Amino acid sequence: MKKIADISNLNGNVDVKLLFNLGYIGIIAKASEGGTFVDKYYKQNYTNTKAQGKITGAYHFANFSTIAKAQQEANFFLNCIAGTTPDFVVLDLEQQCTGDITDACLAFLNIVAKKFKCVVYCNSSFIKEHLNSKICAYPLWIANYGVATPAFTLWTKYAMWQFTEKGQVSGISGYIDFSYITDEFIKYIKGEDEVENLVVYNDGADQRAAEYLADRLACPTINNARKFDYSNVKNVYAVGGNKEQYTSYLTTLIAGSTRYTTMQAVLDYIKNL
Amino acid sequence: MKKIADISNLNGNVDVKLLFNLGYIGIIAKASEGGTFVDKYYKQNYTNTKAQGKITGAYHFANFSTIAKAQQEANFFLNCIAGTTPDFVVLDLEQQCTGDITDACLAFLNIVAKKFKCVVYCNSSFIKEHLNSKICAYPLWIANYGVATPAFTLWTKYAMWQFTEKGQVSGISGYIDFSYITDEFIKYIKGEDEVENLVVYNDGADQRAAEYLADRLACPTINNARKFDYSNVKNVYAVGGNKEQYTSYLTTLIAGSTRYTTMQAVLDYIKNL
Amino acid sequence: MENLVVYNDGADQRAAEYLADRLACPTINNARKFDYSNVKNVYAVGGNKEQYTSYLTTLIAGSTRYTTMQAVLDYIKNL
Amino acid sequence: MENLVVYNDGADQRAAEYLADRLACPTINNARKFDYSNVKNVYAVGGNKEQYTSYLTTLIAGSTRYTTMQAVLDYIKNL
C-alpha cells in the first residue's frame, strides 16, 4: 500500500522533497483550525507539493458542536485554501463535544463538498462517541496508532489510515504523521473511472450464456440495446451475434452459429481461463 | 385421422354397429330443429352408441336470428336431450338469416355450455356472411365438401371436418355424413389433460440451463418454488439440484456439482437427443 | 394444464415470470413449437395478439416494457 | 461507471433489469465478488441493505417480489 504524509505549522518550513525521497506520494497540510486560526505554512506546503507533481490535501481542525458554528468554520476553511486547488480536503474531528455531532458535520461538508472532494478524519472512539452512519456518505481517514490493522465502526472500509503520529525526519521540526492511502482512494481523487470487465448480450438465449461468463469473470452484464458509453471499459466481452452489433470498444467475441454452440463456446472459454 | 358419422331422422332406424364396423368412432345424432321439431330417432341413436362404448354427440339445427329466439331454441334442445349425456353437443348453423348473428349464437351457447361442451358447425360461406371472431370461443366443426383440405376464416384450426354429405350404407336409409375428428378434440371431450414435457429449475443459474433444455424440447419451464400439480405430466425434467427438491413425479435429473457442469450436462443431454 | 404464460424473448419474459409466480404455473417461450390445445388458460404477456397461438385466452400488454409490467402487476392485484 | 444495479438470484433480477433498462446501465449478481468503489450510483433491488456492498447508494425494495417490482416501476416513473 502507498503512503502519504501530513504536516502543519508545527513542522515549520518543510523541504517536501525530503518526504518525496522517502516515497510519500503527497502531502496533506493543515490549513485552518476552528473559526479564526490560519495555518501560515499551508500555502507554501500546498504550493511546493503541487509544483512537484505530487498529491495535495488540505485539512481543517474542527472546533464545532452546532450547525451554525460548523457553517462558519466551513466558510473559513474555504477562505484559507482560496488560491489553492488541493486534490481533496479533510474535516479533522477531535474536538471536545457532547453527544452526536453528525448533523453539524454534514452542514460543514455540505458547504465544502460543492467545491472539493471531502474526507472525514477521526479515531475509533470518536466515531462511537459522536457520530452516526449518516457520516458514511464521505470516505474515512482513520487514525489508529499501534495496531496491525485498523478497527472502526459505521464505515466498513477506509480511504486512508494514519498509523503513526511520531514520524521524524532530520531537517523537519516536530513530528510528522504518516498514513497508508488505498489504490481505490487514489483513483477517486484522480477522476479515474476504468471498469475492468463487462459482458454484453442481446435479448434472448444469449443472455443465459452471458451470465455464466459474468459469473466466472465476477463482473456485470449489460443488454446491448442499452445506450451506454463503453470508452472506459478495459475488457468488453460480447456473447452471441456479430461484431457489427456491438460497441467499437469490443475486444472479445464468443459466438457460435446456434444458441447451443454459443453456450458451448462460453463454457470452453471459461475452462481455458 | 379418425372418423365420426352423423345421422338424423332422415336415416330411420339405424344399426349403429354397421358404422362401427366401418371404423367410425362414434355417432353425432340430430336431436332437434328450430323451436318445436323433435328428432324421434335421437334417443335410440344416442342410446345404442353410448351402450356400445362409442363417442356420442347431439346436434341442434338452428332456426334463429335474434337473441330471444336463440334462447328459446337452446332451452328446447336441452329439453330434447334430457335423459341423455352426450360427450358434446353441436349448434348447427345453416339457417336463412341476415347479417351478423354472432350474439344470438352466443346466447344459445351460453345456456347450453353450462351443461355440455359445445361445438359450432357451419360452412365457409356462412362464417364470412354471418359470424365474427367472437364465435371462436367454441371449437369449429367445418362442413367443406369436395376439398382436399378445409378452408375457413376466423378460426385457425378445426375440431371436426365434415367432408361428405353423400355417405351410403346398405341397410341405412338416406345419406350419412362423414367427418374427420382430430386427436386434440377427442382428448378434449374425454377430459384428457396430459402435458408431454416440463422442465423444472430453482432460482438462479440453473434457470439458464433449463431454458436451453426447454428450447430443445420445445416445452415450458416452471420455477420449482411454484406449488404445482405435476401428476398429469409425462416427462418431468429437472435441471440442477437434488432429486429430493422436486416433485415425486420427476423422471429425468440433469445436474452437476457446479453451475458450469450442470450447463455442460444439459448441452451433452441435448446433443445425445 | 390449467394455466400457461407465453412471452417473446426479451423484457416481457420478466413480466411473464411474475404472472406465472402468481398463477403458480409454467411459462413458455413463444418461439417454441408447442401444442396449446389442452391448456385451459393461455396468457400472453407483451406485444400483440397476432404474434401468439390462436389458443390465446388473455393478452396482457402495454405500449412499453414498463406499462406491460404495470398491467401484469395490476392483473395480479385484482386477482 | 455512473450507474449499476445489483440483484440477488431469483425474482428480483427481473426488477433489476427494468431499472437497468431505464438507467441504461449494467446489472450485476450480488454473489459476484466485485469492486464497487468506482461506481457513482449503486442501486440494489430487493431484500435488505445488509445483504449488499457498503458502497450502496439506493435500495429499492418491498416486502414481496411484487411490491419490489412496483417500487422499481414507481422509481422509473418519477425519474
Numbering used by the authors:
A (entry chain A), B (entry chain A): 1 to 273
C (entry chain B), D (entry chain B): 195 to 273
Give verbatim lines from the article:
The CTP1L endolysin from ΦCTP1 targets Clostridium tyrobutyricum, a food-borne bacterium associated with food spoilage in the dairy industry. The CTP1L gene encodes an N-terminal glycosyl hydrolase domain followed by a C-terminal domain (CBD) that shares a common fold with the C-terminal domains of the CD27L endolysin that targets Clostridium difficile, a gut pathogen that can cause debilitating and life-threatening diarrhea and colitis, and CS74L, which targets Clostridium sporogenes. Endolysins pass into the peptidoglycan layer and degrade the cell wall, killing the bacterial host cell and releasing the bacteriophage progeny. The genetically encoded production of the truncated CBD plays an essential role in endolysin complex formation and the activity of these endolysins.
Here, we present a crystal structure of the full-length CTP1L endolysin in complex with the truncated C-terminal domain. The structure was refined to a resolution of 1.9 Å, and it contains one copy of a full-length CTP1L endolysin as well as a copy of the truncated CBD in the asymmetric unit. The full-length CTP1L endolysin consists of the enzymatically active domain (EAD) (residues 1–190) and a CBD (residues 195–274) connected by a linker of four residues. The EAD consists of a (β/α)5β3 barrel, where strand β6 is directly connected to strand β7, and strand β8 runs anti-parallel to the other β strands. The active site of the CTP1L catalytic domain contains a phosphate ion, surrounded by the catalytic residues Asp-92, Glu-94, Tyr-121, and Asp-177. The truncated CBD is closely associated with the CBD of the intact endolysin, in an arrangement that is similar to the CBDs reported earlier for the crystal structure of the CTP1L mutant V195P. The two CBDs are arranged side-by-side, and the buried surface area covered by the truncated CBD is 2560 Å2. In contrast, there is an extensive hydrogen-bonding network between the truncated CBD and the CBD of the full-length endolysin. The close association of the head-on and side-by-side dimers creates a heterotetramer assembly that buries a surface area of 8410 Å2, suggesting that the heterotetramer is the predominant oligomeric state of CTP1L present in solution. An anomalous dispersion map revealed the presence of a sulfur site situated between Val-195 of the full-length endolysin and the N-terminal Val-195 of the truncated CBD.
